[PDB]
């Protein structure tokens, strides 16, 4: 480093995967009604 910093994202990869799983399960089971 030389005065350079990298900050971590607020959302972790597991949380993003959880949103993806939730969206996909909702669209499989309900259709478009959950939107």
């Amino acid at each position: 480093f030389n005065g350079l910093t990298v900050l971590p994202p607020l959302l972790t990869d597991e949380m993003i995967a959880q949103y993806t799983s939730a969206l996909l399960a909702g669209t499989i089971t309900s259709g478009w009604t959950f939107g």
């Binding site: 480093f1 030389n2 005065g3 910093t5």
Partner: protein, 50 residues
Amino acid sequence: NGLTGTGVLTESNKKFLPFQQFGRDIADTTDAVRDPQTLEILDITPCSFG
């Protein structure tokens, strides 16, 4: 030996050839030095900030 700088010095497991003196990796930043008196490779790390 004339190469100056700040940081924390630790023990390193690198292996120089018998004629190098110090090492750098990318963008030409020194990362390891060989002390003239013991001839053992040290390691340089910037001390923390933020």
